[PDB]
């Protein structure tokens, strides 16, 4: 579980 | 249809705290994180912080780390949100909503939203 | 971390004209790999939740009239309404879903008649 698209 | 469930209205006292469910329906709960939102009266729209369902793992605006504390039960498809030692700022309307993590990150479907009112 | 930026924030328009809103962030949206702008819109009529208009800067979500278009890259977002309606009377949100997330201070779209 990461914190956005980004990731 | 998806469908996101949100308790009623809500009065708490001064510095207690108010736990909230957003009953989730219409698809699998373990796939999409459940986001949730504050909007104060007038306001635009804050967010809170994230649950992934399928692992428990939670993010958090900075602001709320420790203010909001945000769970999940599988067996019940239902998150919940918690607001401990509260304030009269935290007198808001607050959302739950499905987030489509992994492709779109974006807030597909939201609940009706609860209203908090914190006061003596 | 990411703060977002919207303007004007308001704006008033006859039903049937156009109308266009700005939003602005901090750091680009965009995804290298993928290449999509982690952007999207949203929608809140008065007394009701809000609603997904636009991810992905320029993709419609499913159940949003066409009138409703998004576009822009990196830092720089617009979200275009042609052909305004009685209905279209809502605050515009822009929110960033690159790192976390964060929401726009948003756009209010008066109607005049």
């Known amino acids: 579980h990461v914190p956005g698209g980004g990731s | 249809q998806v469908q996101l469930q949100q308790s009623g209205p809500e009065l708490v006292k001064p510095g207690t705290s108010v736990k909230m469910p957003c009953k989730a329906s219409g698809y699998i709960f373990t796939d999409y994180v459940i986001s949730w939102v504050k909007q104060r009266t007038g306001q635009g729209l804050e967010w809170i912080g994230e649950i992934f369902p399928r692992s428990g793992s939670t993010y958090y605006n900075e602001k709320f780390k420790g203010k909001a504390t945000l769970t999940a039960d599988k067996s019940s498809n239902t998150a919940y949100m918690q607001l401990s030692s509260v304030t009269s700022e935290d007198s808001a309307v607050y959302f739950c909503?499905?987030?489509?993590?992994?492709?779109?990150?974006?807030?597909?479907?939201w609940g009706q939203g609860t209203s908090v009112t914190v006061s003596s | 971390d990411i703060v977002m930026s919207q303007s004007p924030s308001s704006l008033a328009v006859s039903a049937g004209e156009k109308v266009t809103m700005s939003c602005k962030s901090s750091?680009?949206?965009?995804?290298?790999?993928?290449?999509?702008?982690?952007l999207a819109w949203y929608q809140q009529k008065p007394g009701q939740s809000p609603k997904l208009l636009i991810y992905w800067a320029s993709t419609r979500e499913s159940g949003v009239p066409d009138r409703f278009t998004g576009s822009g890259s990196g830092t720089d977002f617009t979200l275009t309404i042609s052909s305004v309606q009685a209905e279209d009377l809502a605050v515009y949100y822009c929110?960033?879903?690159?790192?976390?997330?964060?929401f726009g201070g948003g756009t209010k779209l008066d109607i005049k008649r």
């Open positions: 929110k960033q879903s690159f790192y976390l997330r964060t």
């Open positions: 750091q680009s949206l965009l995804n290298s790999r993928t290449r999509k702008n982690y």
């Open positions: 909503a499905r987030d489509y993590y992994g492709t779109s990150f974006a807030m597909d479907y």
